[PDB]
Amino acid sequence: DNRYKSYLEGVRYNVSAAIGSIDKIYNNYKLFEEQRTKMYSTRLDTVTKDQAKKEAEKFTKEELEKDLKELLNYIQVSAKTATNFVYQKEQYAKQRLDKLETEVKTLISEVQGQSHPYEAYKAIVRSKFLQMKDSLEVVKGVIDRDGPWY
């Protein structure tokens, strides 16, 4: 019905948003790591090291924690709406979102434990983080299709 379409539209919206968060954090980590390496390089001059230090100092622990909180919020709202997908073609999305919610809660718990930006990033971009985009893309494929599942 039209109510079900509204549920699909909202989950699609939030899962896309979550994937944006996953892409943002990972890329922020990559850039942070690149700039940190430069800033401590033995083969680079002070001008270059200085610029790297300035770019590295922008990656705060607070931005990461807020990014993970945003990610959790999009996923947890989606998981609740996805109860409606039980016994429907999109059902597989419900279990995957519940499990992602649990996993992102763990990452937030990790980031709080750490005090410095680089170590917080290093603690959270590991095995389970690095499968999250793939899992959300599985969800996306379940909830937003333009033809059969081949």
Side-chain angles (χ1 to χ4, degrees), residues 117-149:
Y118 174 65
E119 280 94 345
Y121 272 94
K122 197 166 143 156
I124 74 101
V125 174
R126 301 203 192 243
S127 185
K128 292 325 162 237
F129 176 93
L130 293 169
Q131 307 170 325
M132 273 181 198
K133 181 161 171 183
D134 183 43
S135 298
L136 286 156
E137 279 173 350
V138 172
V139 173
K140 192 168 186 152
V142 169
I143 64 187
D144 187 3
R145 287 213 81 92
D146 287 329
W149 181 325

Side-chain angles (χ1 to χ4, degrees), residues 7 14 16-18 20-21 28 32 43 52-53 56 62 66 76 84 95 106 108 115 117-118 123 148:
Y7 300 150
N14 299 324
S16 283
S21 292
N28 268 352
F32 187 8
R43 278 183 184 266
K53 190 186 243 192
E62 285 100 344
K66 181 160 193 200
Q76 65 181 359
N84 291 290
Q95 168 184 214
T106 294
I108 295 166
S115 42
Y118 174 65

